[PDB]
């Protein structure tokens, strides 16, 4: 199946600073141009909140601070103005095949 | 908006099988895809299974294939999952999952999830 | 369109040179076997057409001479003034 | 240093290095059990010592495990067609051994790159290091990464937990050619005394022929080594010693 | 179609298991050439 | 540049194999016989005025460089693809002591040259310093040997790059010709073969420059460059019938493609051919072009019907129709000028015909003229947010055209509606057929209408007097996708006249 | 013995590396057909 290894796992970035986390699947999740990746905002004891539900699509009602990048297995998230409270565990998920595996988790701190 | 309701916490004895469902509000339950997931703190979220509420097939992940029975109820906009041979390791906090597609026939995105119910066997 | 198109293959033939002795001369005459001169040394150099093919490089002569280099289909080439 | 080196280059830009003016003991390589695959296509592993070769090229790079098969004369694949293409008429031997403990760490080892996208096929034995963004064809794009255009270099996913077919396998492609030029590096077969006017078995830099040797008045220019006849069988040889 | 047209080289280059296929290619080719030569010689000798 | 005939020159040794009385014909890169060779003249004195001109002559798969100068004015050559630090560059330098062939990534100066000085005591022109490259990075190869360039005499050199090897063949023969290559035959022995392993596109001759030239004075008092006479030819892949004598030297050769006589010599493998007719080759007429013909597209996708129709669904009830299992011609769609807006964000509309996509969707909806721009990939707008949303990563065409004649009239088009208020922005490609009142507000009114509660749908007003801002401009959004499945809808197979 | 008797399809529906094997089968078959035809032509021409 598809396994996601989140790198560099837990990350610490200053407030309002570039933050980059990338998880690369064992085999590519993009089929033909379109990519099937989901990035989640899971607070402790709170439901996960969408950030990027495709290769670059951004969910409405959510600040544009989160940015989409990456191709094939390697997908990178950019947060130039990192804000205080939005830091939490980050998961990345591949929707191409039936295993439907998610990421390990990405702790963020100021 | 869209609201999904879950029990705050559930304390049960080991070996008990129970139904967990999410009430769907603000959207049509039948058209949107129904999935399930469990959370264990300190461990990665891992997916459960898939049913389309109105005339849809069912698939599950290989490790937990047929381990838990899963059903959908058109009335009350709730999808019922049934356990089988529940254990301590099987216990986890379960989240209601909704999936959406641009064109259908694929899982383009997951729009809304529920708060989740904690299946604590303490 | 409801029409019938006969397919005949593109014209091909064996390029056969007509040269006298190397010591005698360096000029050559080229025979294009069973090829029309239309689709054809550079073209236009004393081009002459016969049944054997399009003979390029030698000018046709109305006078009849004994055969020296047989072109084919009754044409013979010789090195003469 | 060709085989037990600390560092080896990626497939897209591999190391091609000269081997000449030496004595080559291929037998110590062949008998070694470290090399899992020793498929020799134009030669035989045991009989490499007898031959004498004008030039030896060692092409070394790191590939994934399942891709070992497609590095062979005339096989198609990702690595074969966009990263490293051997000729169809390839005379040489491919040497591959597992390297999971060597160039794969506990974390993801990602320094090795393979060109995932390229406009067309790769020519035999040519190194393309271009990093221009690849356009699928639907829309033109600039140098900046786009929806339809992707960075061509893709990183190998190497983990210690990966099984066979997903583990790094060092490959050293020893490409041998006999261009009839004077040979430089070859086997350790000991030289013997030269015999003339007597029917003997002669091995002059790997010709390996039988005949009687007579001194000849024919003059050979310094660059050229041996002569030939109508049959393209050797009619005169210049001594190597 | 063989790797080389001299038997001594392939015999010194390839061990018999996979050498035999190249030697068989050369044998088939040279036997075809010799059969053609012998047939031409037989027809020419009939002419002579 | 004045051209002169090659006159059967450029013949070298193909392989280092001895042959005696052997008429061995081989195909190789060779200078064609009787080729018109350009006598480039680099620097021509006016009065002694310097005229520096070292052109970047193309390599053209071989250079038959030659010079009749006995003063040894030429000193080395320049070979490279772009002659910059990024690309590997080839250098040949011929000083008095030895020849230096050095290959690195070289950042060349504007004028690469060798600087020599005259010393009064020694009375000779020694090398002062070398000024050809600014930097020497990623150095690969170097070679030192006896200088072949030095020691009336005509010096010939063939430069070839084959399989990463630099082939240099040198021959020196004294001649009395003024400015024409001799009408004689001279083979070229392989001087040296070098495994450079780089690609060479343009060839530049390097000339020694004396101390008088090195001074910034416009006139070189001690040196004159007017003798810079050299020939440059280009080799072509022509089969050659080389003739080896008893010593193995090529005393003569013929170029097969030059004339039919030489083709006859190559065919018979004899220089003297007896009178007769010889089937040298076969004449084959190549195809002029390619014609492809295929029948009319039987399963024509009904794009004409869906685009040109009388009645359509409204924006809130926008109709999604599956265009599949048929071949679709987008050429008529693109060529049509009836539509005011023809924008394809995902793909260039010009090449929409060639591509094959597995699944195609068309959306029919009605929006105001001023809000046509709202329907755009990742566009924030009332109508865009509320009823019809288009994703950031969109692969499709948004088509709009004026609809005043189609449906606009004096009677208001109250049947069409737009969702003025809704609880949340709609997801891309989501249908919104909702009769819910959407009371919202501080307190839900629980009625059809309220002070803070309004029905989501509001009636369009379409009038001819409304003008450009409010006229219909009925908009169609075409959709494309690929589902990792074989494409069943695609452009018609091309047919030529 | 080749999978098709027209070389265009085998040169199109196969990538070269295993395609030249079928091309070799067809080249050998057609060359044998010409050798047979030319030999019969030589014998018939001797009779004529
Ligand atoms: C060559 O083509 C022309 C076409 O105008 C035709 O008139 C002529 O008869 C052709 N030659 C032969 C020998 O048929
Ligand atoms: C041969 O006779 C024909 C008769 O019309 C004439 O046209 C042609 O010019 C003559 N050719 C020569 C070489 O006299
Ligand atoms: C490096 O590897 C080769 C091949 O296995 C081996 O012969 C050699 O001894 C190794 N180097 C050392 C220092 O052991
Ligand atoms: C022959 O040389 C002349 C000038 O000497 C030149 O104009 C012409 O192009 C040449 N012909 C060729 C290169 O075919
Ligand atoms: C070969 O070289 C010798 C060297 O002296 C010379 O005398 C002779 O003329 C050359 N040619 C032949 C055919 O021997
Ligand atoms: C316009 O309508 C006509 C109906 O007669 C149809 O044939 C045509 O294809 C339509 N144009 C487009 C661009 O769809």
Nearest-by-CA chain D residue for G15: D76
Helix (H) or strand (E) holding C31: strand C29-33
Which residues sit opposite F365 in a β-bridge?
F475
CA pseudo-torsion sign A61, A65, A69, A75: negative
Nearest to A47 among B106, B108, B116 (CB): B116
Report yes or no: F147 and F96 within 8 Å, Cβ to Cβ: yes
Q: Which CATH number fits domain B3-120: 2.60.40.10, 2.60.40.1930, 3.30.70.20, 3.90.1150.10?
A: 2.60.40.10
CA pseudo-torsion sign C66, C72, C74, C78: negative
Place of tokens 């680099």: F42
Backbone angles phi, psi at A42, to 5 degrees: -105, 105
- What does DSSP assign to residue B113? B
Closest C-alpha to A93, from A38, A41, A42, A54: A38
Report yes or no: A50 and A59 within 8 Å, Cβ to Cβ: yes
Asked if F260 and C17 come within 8 Å (Cβ–Cβ), the reply is yes
Q: Tell me the CA end-to-end span of chain D in Å, nearest whole number.
A: 28
Q: Which of residues 93-122 of B touch F (CB under 8 A)?
A: 100-103, 105-106, 109, 111
The token pair that represents F158 in the structure block: 């063939």
CA angle (B44, B46, B48) in 5-degree steps: 160
Query: At A66, is the secondary structure helix, strand, or coil?
Result: strand
F217 vs F109: CA distance, rounded Å: 19
D193 vs F112: CA distance, rounded Å: 53
F149 vs F74: CA distance, rounded Å: 8
Residue A104 placed within a domain = no
The ligand minimizing its distance to the Cα of C60 is: 2
Query: At G32, is the secondary structure helix, strand, or coil?
Result: helix
Pair type for strands C53-56 and C69-72? unpaired
User: Buried b vs exposed e over B45-58: b needs ≥16 C-beta within 10 Å?
Assistant: bbbbbbbbbeeeee
Residue A76 placed within a domain = yes
CA pseudo-torsion sign E29, E30, E35, E40: positive
Nearest to F277 among C12, C31, C41 (CB): C31
Sheet of B81-82, strands arranged across: B19-20, B81-82, B69-70
Ligand 5 atom closest to the CA of F245, numbered from 1 = 13
Task: CATH number of the domain at F105, please.
Answer: 2.60.120.960
Name D65's Cβ contacts closer than 8 Å, sequence gap at least 6. Answer: D98, D162, D164, D165, D166, D167, D168, D169
Place of tokens 């075809």: E32
With an 8 Å Cβ cutoff, the interface of chain F facing chain C consists of 259-261, 263-265, 271-285, 287
B69 vs B82: CA distance, rounded Å: 5
- F-chain CB neighbours of C69 within 8 Å are 275-277
Among E7, E11, E13, the residue to mutate for chain D (most D Cβ within 10 A): E13
F490 vs F496: CA distance, rounded Å: 18
- Which residues precede chain breaks (C–N over 2.5 Å) in chain E? none
F449 vs F434: CA distance, rounded Å: 16
F150 vs F168: CA distance, rounded Å: 15
- What does DSSP assign to residue G27? H
Backbone angles phi, psi at F16, to 5 degrees: -80, 60
CA distances from F325 to D26, F11, F14, F298, F484 (A): 61, 64, 60, 11, 16
Pair type for strands A11-12 and A108-109? parallel
F383 vs F475: CA distance, rounded Å: 13
Q: CB of D232 within 8 Å of any CB in chain F?
A: no
Report yes or no: F347 and D139 within 8 Å, Cβ to Cβ: yes
Closest C-alpha to F76, from F4, F5, F131: F131
F155 vs F435: CA distance, rounded Å: 95
Residue A18 placed within a domain = yes
D neighbour chains, 3+ CB pairs within 8 Å? A, E, F, G
The token pair that represents F78 in the structure block: 């320049």
B vs G contact (3+ beta-carbon pairs below 8 A): no
C48 vs C41: CA distance, rounded Å: 13
Q: CB of G41 within 8 Å of any CB in chain E?
A: no
B58 vs B35: CA distance, rounded Å: 10
CA angle (A98, A103, A108) in 5-degree steps: 160
SS (H, E, C) D21-85: CEECCHHHHHHCCCCCECCECCCCCHHHCCCEECEEEEEEEEEEHHHHCCCCCCCCCHHHHHHCC
- What does DSSP assign to residue A63? -
CA pseudo-torsion sign F127, F133, F136, F140: negative
A48 vs A27: CA distance, rounded Å: 25
Evaluate: CB of C36 within 6 angstroms of ligand 1: yes
The token pair that represents E42 in the structure block: 């037989």
Helix (H) or strand (E) holding G29: helix G16-47
Closest C-alpha to F243, from F23, F5, F469, F33: F23
Which residues sit opposite F237 in a β-bridge?
F29
The ligand minimizing its distance to the Cα of F307 is: 6
The token pair that represents C41 in the structure block: 């040394």
Resolution (A): 3.1
User: Buried b vs exposed e over A6-29: b needs ≥16 C-beta within 10 Å?
Assistant: bbeeebebeeeeebebbbbbbebb
D181 vs D223: CA distance, rounded Å: 8
Q: How was this structure determined?
A: cryo-EM
Q: What is the DSSP string of A35-46?
A: --EEEEEE-TTS
Q: Which of F20, F243, F247 to mutate to test the pocket of ligand 5 (most atoms within 8 A of CB)?
A: F247
CA angle (E27, E30, E32) in 5-degree steps: 105
Ligand 5 atom closest to the CA of F247, numbered from 1 = 1
Asked if D148 and A33 come within 8 Å (Cβ–Cβ), the reply is yes
Residue A50 placed within a domain = yes
B20 vs B5: CA distance, rounded Å: 11
Torsion of CA D63, D64, D69, D75, to 10 degrees: -70
The token pair that represents D226 in the structure block: 């041996």
Name C33's Cβ contacts closer than 8 Å, sequence gap at least 6. Answer: C13, C14, C15, C16, C52, C53, C72, F283
The token pair that represents D121 in the structure block: 């096929």
Place of tokens 């004396």: F210
Closest residue (by CA) to atom 5 of ligand 2?
C62
F247 vs B18: CA distance, rounded Å: 101
A28 vs D78: CA distance, rounded Å: 14
Using only the alpha carbons of chain E, give its radius of gyration: 15
Name F490's Cβ contacts closer than 8 Å, sequence gap at least 6. Answer: F327, F328, F355, F356, F357
Backbone angles phi, psi at D78, to 5 degrees: -65, -60
D30 vs D48: CA distance, rounded Å: 10
Which residues span the domain enclosing A84?
A: 4-94
CA angle (B98, B103, B105) in 5-degree steps: 70
**Cα-to-centroid distance, F207 and ligand 4 (Å):** 27
CA distances from C14 to A59, C52, C77, F64, F238 (A): 73, 11, 17, 35, 21
E4 vs E1: CA distance, rounded Å: 8
Task: CATH number of the domain at A90, please.
Answer: 2.60.40.10
Q: What is the DSSP string of B49-95?
A: EEE-TTT--EEE-STTTTTSEE--BTGGGB--EE-SS--TTT--EEE
Cis peptide preceding D45, ω within 30 of 0: no
Q: For residue F122, how many C-alpha atoms fall within 13 Å in the half-sphere facing its CB?
A: 7
SS (H, E, C) chain F: CEEEECCCCCCECCCCEECCCCEEEEEEEECCCCCEEEECECCCCCCCECCCCCCCEECCCCEEEEECCCCCCEEEEEEECCCCCCCEEEEEEECCCCEEEEEEEEEEEEEEEEEEEEECCCCEEEEEEEEEEEEEEEEEEEEEECCCCCCCEEEEEEEEEECCEEEEEEEEEECCCCCCCCCCCCCEEEEEEECCCCCCCEEEEEEEECHHHHCCCCECCCCCCCCCECEECECEEEEEEEEECCCCCEEEEEECCCCHHHHHHHHHCCCCCCCEEEEEEEEECCCCCCCCCCCCCCCECCHHHHHCCCCCCCCCCCEEEEECCCECCCHHHHHCCCCCEEEECCCCHHHCCCCEECEEEEEEECCCCCCHHHCCCCCCCHHHHHCCCCCCCCCEEEEEECCCCCCCCCCCCCCCEEECCCCCCCCCCCCCCCCCCCCCCCCCCCCCCCCCCCCCEEECCCCHHHCCCCCCCEEEEEEEECCCCCCCEECCCCCCC
The ligand minimizing its distance to the Cα of D29 is: 3
- What does DSSP assign to residue A95? -
Query: How many independent structural domains does chain A possess?
Result: 1
Sheet of F236-244, strands arranged across: F23-30, F236-244, F250-255
Which residues sit opposite F479 in a β-bridge?
F361, F396
Domain ranges of chain B: 3-120
A90 vs A42: CA distance, rounded Å: 7
Backbone angles phi, psi at D46, to 5 degrees: -75, -35
Residue A103 placed within a domain = no
B58 vs B48: CA distance, rounded Å: 11
Torsion of CA F173, F176, F182, F183, to 10 degrees: -120
Phi-psi region of G40 (alpha: psi -120 to 50; beta: other; left: phi over 0): alpha
Hey, how many other C-beta atoms are within 10 angstroms of the C-beta on E35? 12
Report yes or no: D92 and D172 within 8 Å, Cβ to Cβ: no
* Length reported for chain B: 122
Nearest-by-CA chain D residue for F196: D18
Which residues sit opposite F174 in a β-bridge?
F153
D27 vs D32: CA distance, rounded Å: 8
Pair type for strands D113-115 and D153-155? antiparallel
F474 vs F368: CA distance, rounded Å: 8
SS (H, E, C) chain D: CCCCCCCCCCCCCCEEEEECCEECCHHHHHHCCCCCECCECCCCCHHHCCCEECEEEEEEEEEEHHHHCCCCCCCCCHHHHHHCCCCCCCCEEEEEEECHHHHCCCCCECCCEEECCCCCCCCCCCCCCCCCCEECCCCCCCCCCCCCEECCEEECCECCCCCCCCCEEEEEEEEEECCCCCCCEECCCCCCCCCCCCEEEECCCCCCEEEECCCCCCCCCCCCCEECCCCCCCCECCCCC
Using only the alpha carbons of chain C, give its radius of gyration: 16
Helix (H) or strand (E) holding C12: strand C12-19
Name E45's Cβ contacts closer than 8 Å, sequence gap at least 6. Answer: none
The token pair that represents B88 in the structure block: 């301590």
Evaluate: CB of D32 within 6 angstroms of ligand 3: yes
D140 vs D117: CA distance, rounded Å: 16
- D-chain CB neighbours of F18 within 8 Å are 218, 220-221, 224, 226-228, 236
- What does DSSP assign to residue C52? S
Place of tokens 């030039």: D55
CA angle (F59, F62, F63) in 5-degree steps: 80
Closest C-alpha to F382, from F294, F465, F315, F295: F315
Report yes or no: D55 and D175 within 8 Å, Cβ to Cβ: no
Which residues span the domain enclosing F41?
A: 2-283
């Amino acid at each position: 199946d598809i396994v996601l290894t989140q790198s560099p796992a837990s990350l610490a970035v200053s407030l309002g600073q570039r933050a980059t986390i990338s998880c690369r699947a064992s085999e590519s999740v993009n089929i033909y141009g379109n990519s099937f990746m989901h990035w989640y905002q899971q607070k402790p004891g709170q439901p996960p909140k969408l950030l990027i539900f495709r290769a670059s699509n951004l969910e409405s009602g959510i600040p544009v601070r989160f940015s989409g990048s990456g191709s094939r297995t390697d997908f990178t998230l950019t947060i130039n103005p990192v804000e205080a409270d939005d830091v939490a565990t980050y998961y990345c998920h591949q929707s191409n095949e039936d295993p439907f595996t998610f990421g390990s988790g990405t702790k963020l701190e100021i | 908006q869209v609201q999904l309701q879950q029990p705050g916490a559930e304390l049960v004895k080991p070996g008990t099988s129970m139904k967990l469902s999410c009430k769907a509000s603000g959207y049509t339950f039948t058209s949107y895809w129904m999935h399930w997931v469990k959370q264990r703190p300190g461990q990665g979220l891992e997916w459960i299974g898939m049913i389309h509420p109105n005339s849809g097939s069912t698939k599950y992940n290989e490790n937990f294939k047929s381990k838990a029975t899963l059903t959908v109820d058109k009335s009350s906009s709730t999808a019922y999952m049934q356990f089988s041979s529940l254990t301590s390791e099987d216990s986890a906090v379960y989240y209601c999952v909704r999936s959406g597609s641009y064109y259908g026939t694929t899982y383009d995105y997951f729009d809304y999830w529920g708060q989740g119910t904690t299946l604590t066997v303490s | 369109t409801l029409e019938i198109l006969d397919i005949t293959p593109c014209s091909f033939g064996g390029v056969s040179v007509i040269t006298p002795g190397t010591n005698t001369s360096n000029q050559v005459a080229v025979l294009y076997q069973d090829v029309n001169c239309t689709e054809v040394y550079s073209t236009g150099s004393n081009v002459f057409q016969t049944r054997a093919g399009c003979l390029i490089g030698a000018e046709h002569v109305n006078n009849s001479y004994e055969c020296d280099i047989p072109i084919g289909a009754g044409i013979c080439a010789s090195y003469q003034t | 240093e060709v085989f037990n080196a600390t560092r080896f280059a990626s497939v897209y830009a591999w190391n091609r290095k000269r081997i000449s003016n030496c004595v080559a003991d291929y037998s110590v390589l062949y008998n070694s059990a470290s090399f899992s695959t020793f498929k020799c296509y134009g030669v035989s592993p045991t009989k490499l010592n007898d031959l004498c070769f004008t030039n030896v090229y060692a092409d070394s790079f790191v590939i994934r495990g399942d891709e070992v098969r497609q590095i062979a004369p005339g096989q198609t694949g990702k690595i074969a067609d966009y990263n490293y293409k051997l000729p169809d008429d390839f005379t040489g031997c491919v040497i591959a051994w597992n390297s999971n403990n060597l160039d794969s760490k506990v974390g993801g080892n990602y320094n090795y790159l393979y060109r995932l996208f390229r406009k067309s096929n790769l020519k035999p034995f040519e190194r393309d290091i271009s990093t221009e963004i690849y356009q699928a064809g639907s829309t033109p794009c600039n140098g900046v990464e786009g929806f339809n255009c992707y960075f061509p270099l893709q990183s190998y996913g190497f983990q210690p937990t990966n099984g066979v077919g997903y583990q790094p396998y060092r490959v050293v492609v020893l490409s041998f050619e006999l261009l009839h030029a004077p040979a430089t590096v070859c086997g350790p077969k000991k030289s013997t005394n030269l015999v003339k006017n007597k029917c003997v078995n002669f091995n002059f830099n790997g010709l390996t022929g039988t005949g009687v040797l007579t001194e000849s008045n024919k003059k050979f220019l310094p660059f050229q080594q041996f002569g030939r006849d109508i049959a393209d069988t050797t009619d005169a040889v210049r001594d190597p010693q | 179609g063989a790797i080389s047209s001299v038997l001594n080289d392939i015999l010194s280059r390839l061990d018999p298991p996979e050498a035999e296929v190249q030697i068989d290619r050369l044998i088939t080719g040279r036997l075809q050439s010799l059969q053609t030569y012998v047939t031409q010689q037989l027809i020419r000798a009939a002419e002579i | 540049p004045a051209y002169t005939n090659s006159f059967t020159r450029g013949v070298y040794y193909p392989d280092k194999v001895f042959r005696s009385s052997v008429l061995h014909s081989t195909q190789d890169l060779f200078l064609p016989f009787f080729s018109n060779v350009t006598w480039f003249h680099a620097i021509h004195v006016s009065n002694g005025t310097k005229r520096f001109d070292n052109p970047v002559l193309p390599f053209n798969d071989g250079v038959y460089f030659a010079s009749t100068e006995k003063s040894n004015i030429i000193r080395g050559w320049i070979f490279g693809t772009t002659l910059d630090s990024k690309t590997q560059s080839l250098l040949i330098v011929n000083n008095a002591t030895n020849v230096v062939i050095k290959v690195c990534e070289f950042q060349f100066c504007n004028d690469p040259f060798l600087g020599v000085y005259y010393h009064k005591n020694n009375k000779s022109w020694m090398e002062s310093e070398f000024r050809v490259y600014s930097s020497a990075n990623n150095c690969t190869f170097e070679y030192v040997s006896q200088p072949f360039l030095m020691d009336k005499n005509l010096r010939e050199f063939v430069f070839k790059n084959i399989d990463g090897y630099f082939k240099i063949y040198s021959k020196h023969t004294p001649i009395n010709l003024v400015r024409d290559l001799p009408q004689g035959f001279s083979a070229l022995e392989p001087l040296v073969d070098l495994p450079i392993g780089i690609n060479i596109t343009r060839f530049q001759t390097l000339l020694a420059l004396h101390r008088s030239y090195l001074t910034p004075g416009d006139s070189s008092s001690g040196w004159t460059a007017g003798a810079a006479a050299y020939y440059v030819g280009y080799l072509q892949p022509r089969t050659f019938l080389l003739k080896y004598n008893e010593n193995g030297t090529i005393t003569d050769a013929v170029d097969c493609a030059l004339d039919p006589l030489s083709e006859t010599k190559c065919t018979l493998k004899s220089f003297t051919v007896e009178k007769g007719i010889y089937q040298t080759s076969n004449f084959r007429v190549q195809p002029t072009e390619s014609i492809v013909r295929f029948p009319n597209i039987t399963n024509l996708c009904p794009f004409g019907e869906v685009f040109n129709a009388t009645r359509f669904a409204s924006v809130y009830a926008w109709n999604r129709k599956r265009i599949s299992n048929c071949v679709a011609d987008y050429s008529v769609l693109y060529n049509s000028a009836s539509f005011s807006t023809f924008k394809c964000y995902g793909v260039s509309p010009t090449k929409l015909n060639d591509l094959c996509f597995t699944n195609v969707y068309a959306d029919s909806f009605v929006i105001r003229g001023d809000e046509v721009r709202q329907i755009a990939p990742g566009q924030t707008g009332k109508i865009a947010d509320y009823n019809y949303k288009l994703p950031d990563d969109f692969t499709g065409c948004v088509i709009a055209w004026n609809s005043n004649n189609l449906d606009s009239k004096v009677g208001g088009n109250y049947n069409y509606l737009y969702r003025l208020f809704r609880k949340s922005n709609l997801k891309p490609f989501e249908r919104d057929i909702s009769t819910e009142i959407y009371q919202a507000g501080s307190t839900p009114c629980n009625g059809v209408e309220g002070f803070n509660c309004y029905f989501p749908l509001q009636s369009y007003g379409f009038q001819p007097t409304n003008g450009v801002g409010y006229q219909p401009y009925r908009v169609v959004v075409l959709s494309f996708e690929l589902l990792h499945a074989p494409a069943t809808v695609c452009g018609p197979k091309k047919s030529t006249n």
